[PDB]
Write an enzyme that holds these catalytic residues in place. Sequence first.
Site, short mmCIF file in Angstrom:
data_model
loop_
_atom_site.label_atom_id
_atom_site.label_comp_id
_atom_site.label_asym_id
_atom_site.label_seq_id
_atom_site.Cartn_x
_atom_site.Cartn_y
_atom_site.Cartn_z
N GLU A 1 -6.86 2.76 14.44
CA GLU A 1 -6.88 1.30 13.98
C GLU A 1 -7.60 0.29 14.30
O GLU A 1 -6.81 0.26 15.59
CB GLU A 1 -5.31 1.43 13.37
CG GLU A 1 -4.85 -0.52 12.81
CD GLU A 1 -6.00 -0.34 11.61
OE1 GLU A 1 -6.06 0.26 10.57
OE2 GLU A 1 -6.04 -1.71 11.53
N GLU B 1 -8.87 4.93 3.82
CA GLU B 1 -8.44 4.50 3.51
C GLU B 1 -9.03 2.73 2.74
O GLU B 1 -8.62 1.81 2.54
CB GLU B 1 -7.16 4.46 2.82
CG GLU B 1 -6.93 4.14 1.44
CD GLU B 1 -5.05 3.79 1.66
OE1 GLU B 1 -4.15 4.14 2.38
OE2 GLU B 1 -4.70 3.39 0.98
N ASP C 1 -12.16 -0.29 16.59
CA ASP C 1 -13.07 -0.29 15.22
C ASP C 1 -14.39 0.70 15.56
O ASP C 1 -14.52 1.24 15.99
CB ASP C 1 -13.90 -1.78 15.66
CG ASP C 1 -15.00 -1.63 14.27
OD1 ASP C 1 -15.55 -0.94 13.51
OD2 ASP C 1 -14.84 -2.78 14.02
N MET C 2 -13.91 1.06 14.41
CA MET C 2 -14.42 3.00 14.16
C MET C 2 -15.72 3.05 14.39
O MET C 2 -16.43 3.32 14.56
CB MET C 2 -14.32 3.70 12.81
CG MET C 2 -14.78 3.23 11.84
SD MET C 2 -14.24 3.63 10.15
CE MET C 2 -13.02 3.05 9.86
N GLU D 1 -14.95 -3.83 0.51
CA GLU D 1 -14.32 -3.26 1.67
C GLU D 1 -14.97 -3.09 2.34
O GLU D 1 -14.95 -3.25 4.00
CB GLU D 1 -12.85 -3.05 2.18
CG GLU D 1 -11.85 -4.34 0.61
CD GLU D 1 -10.54 -3.55 0.62
OE1 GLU D 1 -10.21 -2.05 1.88
OE2 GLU D 1 -9.97 -4.04 -0.11
N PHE E 1 0.67 -1.17 -0.11
CA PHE E 1 0.05 0.61 -0.23
C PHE E 1 0.38 1.28 0.15
O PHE E 1 1.18 1.96 -0.73
CB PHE E 1 -0.54 0.24 1.51
CG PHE E 1 -1.93 -0.98 1.54
CD1 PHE E 1 -2.17 -2.07 -0.25
CD2 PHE E 1 -2.68 -1.40 2.34
CE1 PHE E 1 -2.55 -3.50 -0.15
CE2 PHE E 1 -3.43 -2.40 2.19
CZ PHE E 1 -3.69 -3.31 1.60
N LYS F 1 -0.71 8.15 -4.74
CA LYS F 1 -1.34 8.48 -4.41
C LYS F 1 -1.25 9.04 -2.83
O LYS F 1 -2.38 9.41 -2.47
CB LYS F 1 -1.86 6.48 -4.10
CG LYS F 1 -3.04 5.81 -2.95
CD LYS F 1 -3.29 4.96 -2.27
CE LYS F 1 -1.78 4.67 -1.79
NZ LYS F 1 -2.10 3.10 -1.10
N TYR F 2 -0.84 9.16 -1.69
CA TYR F 2 -0.53 9.56 -0.67
C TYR F 2 -0.56 11.14 -1.15
O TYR F 2 -0.96 11.63 -0.36
CB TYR F 2 0.16 8.86 -0.22
CG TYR F 2 -0.15 7.58 0.39
CD1 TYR F 2 -1.48 7.42 1.74
CD2 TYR F 2 0.45 6.07 0.23
CE1 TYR F 2 -1.87 6.73 2.22
CE2 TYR F 2 -0.37 5.33 0.49
CZ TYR F 2 -1.32 5.46 1.22
OH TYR F 2 -2.03 4.29 1.77
C1 LIG Z 1 -5.24 -8.52 -3.23
N1 LIG Z 1 -5.96 -7.22 -3.29
N2 LIG Z 1 -7.44 -7.19 -3.47
C2 LIG Z 1 -7.09 -5.55 -2.83
C3 LIG Z 1 -6.04 -5.24 -2.90
C4 LIG Z 1 -5.18 -4.38 -3.03
C5 LIG Z 1 -4.60 -3.43 -2.95
C6 LIG Z 1 -4.20 -2.16 -3.32
C7 LIG Z 1 -4.65 -0.70 -1.73
C8 LIG Z 1 -4.08 -0.69 -1.55
O1 LIG Z 1 -3.01 1.06 -2.19
N3 LIG Z 1 -5.14 0.95 -0.79
N4 LIG Z 1 -5.87 0.36 0.18
C9 LIG Z 1 -6.69 -0.92 -0.38
C10 LIG Z 1 -8.01 -1.66 0.34
N5 LIG Z 1 -8.20 -0.85 1.11
C11 LIG Z 1 -6.02 -1.99 -1.26
C12 LIG Z 1 -6.43 -3.19 -1.87
C13 LIG Z 1 -5.23 -6.10 -3.38
C14 LIG Z 1 -3.75 -6.49 -2.95
S1 LIG Z 1 -2.37 -7.12 -2.13
C15 LIG Z 1 -1.22 -7.10 -3.59
C16 LIG Z 1 -0.27 -7.07 -3.16
C17 LIG Z 1 0.88 -7.87 -4.27
C18 LIG Z 1 0.70 -6.85 -5.64
C19 LIG Z 1 -1.30 -6.46 -6.07
C20 LIG Z 1 -1.72 -6.41 -4.86
C21 LIG Z 1 -2.73 -6.09 -4.73
C22 LIG Z 1 -3.61 -5.53 -5.69
N6 LIG Z 1 -4.42 -5.40 -6.76
C1 LIG Z 2 -5.53 0.24 4.39
S1 LIG Z 2 -6.81 -0.71 3.91
C2 LIG Z 2 -7.26 -0.23 5.01
C3 LIG Z 2 -7.27 0.00 6.74
O1 LIG Z 2 -8.44 0.07 7.66
C4 LIG Z 2 -8.64 -0.81 8.42
N1 LIG Z 2 -10.01 -0.92 9.01
C5 LIG Z 2 -10.54 -1.46 8.30
N2 LIG Z 2 -11.80 -1.54 8.68
C6 LIG Z 2 -11.74 -0.63 10.05
C7 LIG Z 2 -12.99 -0.47 10.66
N3 LIG Z 2 -14.24 -0.95 10.98
N4 LIG Z 2 -11.90 0.18 11.84
C8 LIG Z 2 -10.85 0.26 11.88
N5 LIG Z 2 -9.77 -0.19 11.22
C9 LIG Z 2 -10.43 -0.69 9.67
C10 LIG Z 2 -7.90 -1.98 8.72
O2 LIG Z 2 -7.54 -2.80 9.54
C11 LIG Z 2 -6.46 -1.49 7.47
O3 LIG Z 2 -5.24 -1.10 8.00
#
Ligand SMILES: Cn1ncc(-c2ccc3c(=O)[nH]nc(CN)c3c2)c1-c1sc2ccccc2c1C#N
Ligand SMILES: CSC[C@H]1O[C@@H](n2cnc3c(N)ncnc32)[C@H](O)[C@@H]1O
Lengths: 625, 305
Positions: free
Chosen positions: A380, A423, A407-408, A432, A315, A321-322
């Site tokens: 978190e 995020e 948990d939020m 999600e 991430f 992204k950030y």
């Molecule tokens: C399988 N998955 N489901 C959802 C994802 C995925 C990817 C990237 C982000 C992010 O940059 N931010 N936030 C999330 C969620 N909140 C996220 C979720 C992934 C993953 S694991 C992973 C590990 C290595 C390379 C690519 C990925 C990839 C993707 N795309």
């Molecule tokens: C960056 S992926 C989303 C992040 O939010 C956190 N998260 C997701 N849902 C909740 C929730 N309901 N309360 C607190 N943290 C959460 C997850 O543990 C992860 O670190």
Amino acid sequence: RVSSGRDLNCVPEIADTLGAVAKQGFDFLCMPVFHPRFKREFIQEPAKNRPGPQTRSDLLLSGRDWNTLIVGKLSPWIRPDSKVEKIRRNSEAAMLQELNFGAYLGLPAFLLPLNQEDNTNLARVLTNHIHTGHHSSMFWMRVPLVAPEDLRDDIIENAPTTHTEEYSGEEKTWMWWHNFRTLCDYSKRIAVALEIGADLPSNHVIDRWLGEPIKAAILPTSIFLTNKKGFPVLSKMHQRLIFRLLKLEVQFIITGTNHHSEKEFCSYLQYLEYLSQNRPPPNAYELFAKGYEDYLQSPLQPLMDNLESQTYEVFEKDPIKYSQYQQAIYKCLLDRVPEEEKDTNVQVLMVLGAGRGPLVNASLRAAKQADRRIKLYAVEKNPNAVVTLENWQFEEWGSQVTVVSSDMREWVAPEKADIIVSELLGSFADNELSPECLDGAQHFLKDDGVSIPGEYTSFLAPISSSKLYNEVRACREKDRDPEAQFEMPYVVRLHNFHQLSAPQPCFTFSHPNRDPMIDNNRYCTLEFPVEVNTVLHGFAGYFETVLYQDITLSIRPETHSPGMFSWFPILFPIKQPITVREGQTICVRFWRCSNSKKVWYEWAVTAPVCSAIHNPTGRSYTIGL
Amino acid sequence: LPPNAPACMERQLEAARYRSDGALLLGASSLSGRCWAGSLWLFKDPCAAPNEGFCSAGVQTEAGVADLTWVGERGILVASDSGAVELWELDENETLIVSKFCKYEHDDIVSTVSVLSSGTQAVSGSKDICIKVWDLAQQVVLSSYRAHAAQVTCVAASPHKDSVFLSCSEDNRILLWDTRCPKPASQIGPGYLPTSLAWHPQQSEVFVFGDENGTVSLVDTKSVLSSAVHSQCVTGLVFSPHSVPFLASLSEDCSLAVLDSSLSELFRSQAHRDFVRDATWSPLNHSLLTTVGWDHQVVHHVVPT
Ligand SMILES: Cn1ncc(-c2ccc3c(=O)[nH]nc(CN)c3c2)c1-c1sc2ccccc2c1C#N
Ligand SMILES: CSC[C@H]1O[C@@H](n2cnc3c(N)ncnc32)[C@H](O)[C@@H]1O
């Protein structure tokens, strides 16, 4: 570096031939394992008793050379779909014989032709061989872009060539392949060796092969042009098709004799290496996405599951992204805190799902460049990442950050927030449960508070990809519904596929959700115009999100955030491929469903044919609350 | 055991053609074993064949011999597995067989070759689906024709029209060619795949062709007589040199048949134990008919006239 092989139909001596083929720079050799003119009789005497040996000896190459350098070829007299019964019989026996010899030798692949419409009995024999042991060998079906009958010279005075466009007729060889592989039940060992002719067909004929399992491209020396210096080259249109094929990393095969005798034969190959070296190198994303191409992944569920350390790492390795989050916060701070209050107005910022700290740091950098004061909470629920946040908070952030391990949806905040930052988005936006999570946190957002992101929208697009369909198919597991793999989405860097219509919006969510009757269930019907003949295998999913005003994140291709690596697309499959004709409309239906414990998706195609409702009641796939 | 002549002749005999004085030309291929090559031979004593020690001349080719034909009295035109058309020529002494040219103009096996009337040009057909016209003197391809849609099984030059020749293919087409016409091919009208062709020697617009199902057919340019002569593919058709000619037919059924004007059977030989590949009538004894096959036999049939 291109992986290329040489195609020969004449091998007087194997060791001599193989040596010469390698010295020219080839990696492998397609050649016959029985003499292509050595017709054999299996039924009628006296010819069935022809003394042996029936072909060359296996001891002429080492086992490694058979395994790695040799692709075998079906003898051309073998015609299992002949109209002459005797010929069908001898061809059946001969075809089993040559195939079993190839298996005997451990050859890594074997080439059979599709040169006419009816290959039913050829398919039956191949399928029988395939179900006779468990082997890893591949079968390359040699099929041309353009059938020989459709490219013959117009030199028959009493049978002229059709000069009128026949849209589907020009696609006939794709139908040769489709029917063959449908009869063979989408065996994973059966792949395409696409043969390219001197004149290319209409573009739609070429695109027909998108999403198909192309393992080799065959380039006859007849198609190469000649430049001033006398070297073989290719037309700009052919070069276009080569580049597209290098993106599929196919193996190229050079067939035919040397027609540029003034130049040695390695000329043809050197030109391919020239085309390969000439193209934009890995551009960060493509550099990084390669390796994950068409690799199915389970979608993350960061709510129900506690993510591992190296998953947060991925991430965090995305500064574009950030920097967008930092800009969203920067702009919001300035709209909420007038200059004259810059020293008196301290805004309360809550990161809801902080992981290991990226938004917390982006929030700090935002307040600095904006010259405004902020009070930060880092919420978190994953206690493992809270370890990271609390070492950070003690070592660097200090008292300006309050880490909350909770948990939020349950946390009792000591004060209300001016801005909540989150995020919680997946590749399909809400997959999600960001809406459920942000609804449960809304109570401690001020009445004028801002949520970043402020809204998001999923998108869908029909796609063709027999390759991906087969990948899903092979995800059967022992102790579950044998079709469960088709009732669940996959995150995947879609690569070998054909998008069939422009993506369209599916589900949208806004935050804060002022509405007094919050219902996050959804029912959407979409209609995709399709202007090609094709086969439907699933729907690609993307999303866009507004972080604040004009600052956005998007993986929807037509608006993809440039330079952002996070989030591959998602894939919703269907159990049975659906034929779609030119000018027809694909109607798909998607539901977002829920109970108190789980959220899920159900989907269905209703035009031009109805599928089954996929994932009814979440029987195959749910997202935990 | 002449000089530069191979001590061993390959097993699979593919061609046999008499010349004016009666010397026999043999073509052989090695279709199994370590080495897949071929060879050319001349037997001034046709009874000594196929014994290598009692031949007049012999030479090895780089690849197998799928077809050949005489080019006059000292020329030999070869269809090679290599995709190449080769011309060899005997020396003044007729003790060596020297290569004249070897041109790689086809992109697959060259299956069939035929010398045109003028004796200065030849036509070849290949599994690459093309037909090429050759100027033997300039050693160059004059024309390349892609009329068919599948391999070219047989090409046969007109006996006396230097611009006319037949061809047939697994696309089920029999084509009549006349290079004087802007579109030089014409389709001669559902049956089984045509496998062999023979012009009538004494009739301009008459020819016979065999099919993959064992049938022999007599055709006129414009209005058909046929007979089931064989139980398998008809590999070849060769008219005798009689005033009223006989018709010899060959087959993968390992039998030789001799047919009359009305395609009726007058002779039948089962001497071969493998495919019968070629047949050539003696210029000296018109009743003697020589055949060769993949059983490595050279048979001399006396045909009852
Ligand atoms: C399988 N998955 N489901 C959802 C994802 C995925 C990817 C990237 C982000 C992010 O940059 N931010 N936030 C999330 C969620 N909140 C996220 C979720 C992934 C993953 S694991 C992973 C590990 C290595 C390379 C690519 C990925 C990839 C993707 N795309
Ligand atoms: C960056 S992926 C989303 C992040 O939010 C956190 N998260 C997701 N849902 C909740 C929730 N309901 N309360 C607190 N943290 C959460 C997850 O543990 C992860 O670190």
